Design a protein around this ligand. Structure first.
Ligand SMILES: *[C@@H]1O[C@H](CO[C@@H]2O[C@@H](C)[C@@H](O)[C@@H](O)[C@@H]2O)[C@@H](O[C@@H]2O[C@H](CO)[C@@H](O)[C@H](O)[C@H]2NC(C)=O)[C@H](O)[C@H]1NC(C)=O
Ligand SMILES: *[C@@H]1O[C@H](CO[C@@H]2O[C@@H](C)[C@@H](O)[C@@H](O)[C@@H]2O)[C@@H](O[C@@H]2O[C@H](CO)[C@@H](O)[C@H](O)[C@H]2NC(C)=O)[C@H](O)[C@H]1NC(C)=O
Ligand SMILES: *[C@@H]1O[C@H](CO)[C@@H](O)[C@H](O)[C@H]1NC(C)=O
Lengths: 538, 528
């Protein structure tokens, strides 16, 4: 009749899961658990409501729908883009989370990893192949949780001050899921007193915002920020700019038939089909850029009482352990989405005039003086027009500005203000990687190793890549268990030292053993983090 | 001895025979080329020397123009070699001619030397400017003049006739006119005159390049460690008026006519004693009275003039020493001394920057600290010493010279560039200063051939090389010897220059190209 391992009772009612086959053995998965009431109709743009209790058994046996989002059509049928696109139907009914647990269920409380996906706050889903938790859970005996959260207008359109579209509800979705983990993870054998958040890109930025928001900060203990930071220039927006964007979107879909009473405007927005909002959301940006990020978290005093930059500087982070890192070529991926002269299908050897144009697109919304400063810093004046060099330099501009330097600034301030910080640069280019060689190790391509995807037999990774994947999973689980990625009791293994504002040490992650190195693009980031904001005042 | 008797338009001269290790040389030292600029003539353009009867005694150097005397390290060779070595006088407008013995009987190419000293000091009589070795070795005629410095040469009340400014530059021009009219009497060829100069002397040369009435007085130019577009080399009309006015107040003077008349009653030495504290801020530089851009001598700023010029038909030799900034740091950069290693702290570095780069905004200063900090070693004392040296040298010498070279080459000129990288075995400054500002000059003039001095045999050969490059350039506009690794022209693209040291010429690219992008391309956009 029934199998007890696959049955669990959470506060809301009963659930039935599936037994998953992994190369190392069985795992229990409960996929598609509802944690909020569906944010439908009148509940569009509103904070999430906790899921009301149910009778009978909910089947948590497959991933639920993807939240409504734009679908990338740049390179149709190309694996490099398609691997990030929705693999379930789009629905506004998307507030479900997923729990993976060992088979049989742990008998003593087990550390929990909670994954928050990225996608620029306009896309992403917990159901992507590359976020499959079955391999981590099996290899390291942790519980893994991932949630869906609203993106785009649905998650971050804000008319600040109003009750009908207060903004940041996508982050509130993440918080509700975190509250759910507190109240329920024990039922799966998980330890609500050992919860580690981790996420990549917009997911990392979200992790960081939970760090800086007191009502979230109580729901977890440790944090991992992969290739993103809450102080990233794309990651937040001001109350005014948020309103301008909300309002422009409304206008574009015929709402108020501009501005006016917020209640009327939002009610008119609620009558539009989801797909219509999605279709117009690319229009609301002030400048042509490679960062299609129309709606993102808003600094409005509520979720964030001040800018993330400010909150970081003012904060006491004693008793916090954090793991942070970046891939070797953060910038390259983004360049084929707009920068003149770039394509995945040629060498993208750009001209100097193409380089100058690329700087404005890769660093949108800075003054001409600031742009000049960028061009000066990144030009090699002994070779000002070498196409190969200009390509590399532009990739560095985009990467440094949007990822590496926000991450370095976060790491430095946290370390100096009480946190134990560990830092990495991921340098392995997958044998399976379908992007061209000149892109190096692009944004996003460490995730599949962290989740242990190369252990999937149907995939064609090398045996060394399997070993490497197992190393990374070990570091992450070590960090989740102890706050330290280092092998507890292993001495002949090279040691990963803490990152500090002075020595600035980090390790390289590739097939070779750990190599300790200094500075996260230190010269470059002094420009973005120390000088450029002073040029902003005067 | 008839070789020592010469008649110039003004009258008759008696010179002196000098010895060198290579043979004799004829020298005519202390020739008057202007009426003495004294009493009512203080601050005025030079008047041509009125003819004389009898024979001028031209066997010894004449007086040094009034100037501050450096007392930072009394008795120290490294500083005393630049101080006056004759008595001070406002009666100082004399020039000197060295020529082969016996005097050439066919037109010989002429080198004309303009000394540096921040426009506040210097003299043609310093040992290190001794023309005898160049003249014997390379058979040129060599001329050097004294020109008025400090307030006496560059105090300006723009618009006034009583003190129009730039008269020290006019002293230089008048001497160049003198050379046109009289150098043939010594065997010199007035159709082959090369100007060379170091530091403010180099800025002077460049200024003559950019001023049409001077441009007809010479044919080729050498600019050593200085350039007319240097941030210290000129002053705007308004700021010149302010500094003049402040000097007047400091010496107790109260209408331009009235002000200048009162200044003219003050002993020269009194003006000198107060010239230092008219500057708008503390600085390692003592540069109160400098050439003023007033539309007359310079119709525009040297920067503007350089950008707008057609320089086809010009050949220029330019260069710098390896460590331009180090020398200046011991004159007021906190934590610096010639007598210790000058290992400064970061706070001292930050302070030093405001002193090495005066009168720029905080934002500008921050940018300087950004560019020159190694953010992996932000506090290493040795690295900080080196970087502050870099800052001062880049800003004041290397990047103005680089900009001048690039623009001239891109606008028709043929440019040759060098970096001078030999530290003299006899150098009396500490080792951490490397090759400091001014210490190529003694090699160019062949001072190492003086047997009474203690240079090595390698060093004498080196000097001979440098004398040959320089005279080659004066004769043909090309320093190269026959095919020897060749010295290529400097171009805005390839940016090639050669290293001058004991080794053969090594060709390299870029005169601190990354650093000078900061000073020459970015920083101007900021101040807008
Ligand atoms: C490299 O590619 C870009 C992108 O163009 C597309 O991708 C190429 C691989 C190739 O398949 C092209 O036919 C595609 O159009 C090129 O930039 C484009 O150039 C075309 C023609 O000049 C122009 O109309 C587009 O606007 C350009 N697009 C952008 C984003 O600038 C680039 O020239 C290619 N470099 C080569 C071929 O050397
Ligand atoms: C290196 O020397 C400087 C200069 O000080 C002078 O030269 C020294 C060799 C010694 O003879 C001192 O007595 C001289 O004053 C030092 O900077 C000075 O430090 C003292 C310390 O109180 C201070 O009073 C002076 O104002 C400083 N002078 C300047 C120009 O900043 C420097 O500390 C020495 N470096 C060392 C000792 O490591
Ligand atoms: C907006 O309109 C609604 C519709 O009746 C009204 O109740 C509300 O008071 C209005 N909002 C404000 C701020 O006045």
């Amino acid at each position: 009749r029934e199998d007890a391992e696959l049955l669990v009772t959470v506060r809301g009612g009963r659930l039935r899961g599936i037994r998953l086959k992994t190369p190392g053995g069985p795992v229990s998965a409960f996929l598609g658990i509802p944690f909020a009431e569906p944010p439908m109709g009148p509940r569009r743009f509103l904070p999430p409501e906790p899921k009301q209790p149910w009778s009978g058994v909910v089947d948590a046996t497959t991933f639920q729908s993807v939240c409504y989002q734009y679908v990338d059509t740049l390179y149709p049928g190309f694996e490099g883009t398609e691997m990030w696109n929705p693999n379930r139907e789009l629905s506004e009914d998307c507030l479900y989370l997923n729990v993976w647990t060992p088979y049989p269920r742990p008998t003593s409380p087990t550390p929990v990893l909670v994954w928050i996906y990225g996608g620029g706050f306009y896309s992403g889903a917990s159901s992507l192949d590359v976020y499959d938790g079955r391999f981590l859970v099996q290899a390291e005996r942790t519980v893994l949780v991932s949630m869906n959260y609203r993106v785009g207008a649905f998650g971050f359109l804000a008319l600040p001050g109003s009750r009908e579209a207060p903004g940041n509800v996508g982050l509130l979705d993440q918080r509700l899921a975190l509250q759910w983990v507190q109240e329920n993870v024990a039922a799966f054998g998980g330890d609500p007193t050992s919860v580690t958040l981790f996420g990549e890109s917009a997911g990392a930025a979200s992790v960081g915002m939970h760090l800086l928001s007191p009502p979230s900060r109580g729901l977890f203990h440790r944090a991992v920020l992969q290739s993103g930071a809450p102080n990233g220039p794309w990651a937040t927006v001001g109350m005014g700019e948020a309103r301008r964007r909300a309002t422009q979107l409304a206008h574009l879909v015929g709402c108020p038939p501009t501005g006016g009473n917020d209640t009327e405007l939002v009610a008119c927005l609620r009558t539009r089909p989801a797909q219509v909002l999605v279709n117009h959301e690319w229009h609301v940006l002030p400048q042509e850029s490679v960062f299609r990020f129309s709606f993102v978290p808003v600094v409005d005093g509520d979720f964030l009482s001040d800018t993330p930059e400010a909150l970081i500087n003012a904060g006491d982070f004693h008793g916090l352990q954090v793991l942070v890192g970046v891939v070797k070529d953060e910038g390259s991926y983004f360049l084929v989405y707009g920068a003149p002269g770039f394509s995945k299908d040629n060498e993208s050897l750009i001209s100097r005039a193409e380089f100058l144009a690329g700087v404005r697109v890769g660093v949108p919304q800075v003054s001409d003086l600031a742009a000049e400063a960028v061009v000066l810093h990144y030009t090699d004046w002994l070779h000002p027009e070498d196409p190969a060099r200009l390509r590399e330099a532009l990739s560095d501009v985009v990467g440094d500005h949007n990822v590496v330097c926000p991450v370095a600034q976060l790491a430095g301030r946290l370390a100096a203000q009480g946190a134990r910080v560990y830092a990495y640069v991921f340098e392995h280019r997958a044998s399976t990687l379908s992007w061209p060689l000149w892109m190096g190790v692009p944004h996003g391509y460490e995730i599949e190793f962290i989740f242990g995807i190369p252990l999937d037999p149907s995939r064609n990774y090398t045996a060394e890549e399997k070993i490497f994947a197992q190393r990374l999973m070990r570091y992450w689980a070590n960090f989740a268990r102890t706050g330290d990625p280092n092998e507890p009791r292993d001495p002949k293994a090279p040691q990963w030292p803490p990152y500090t504002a002075g020595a600035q040490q980090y390790v390289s992650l590739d097939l070779r053993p750990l190599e300790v190195r200094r500075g996260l693009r230190a010269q470059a980031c002094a420009f973005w983090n120390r000088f450029l904001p002073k040029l902003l005042s005067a």
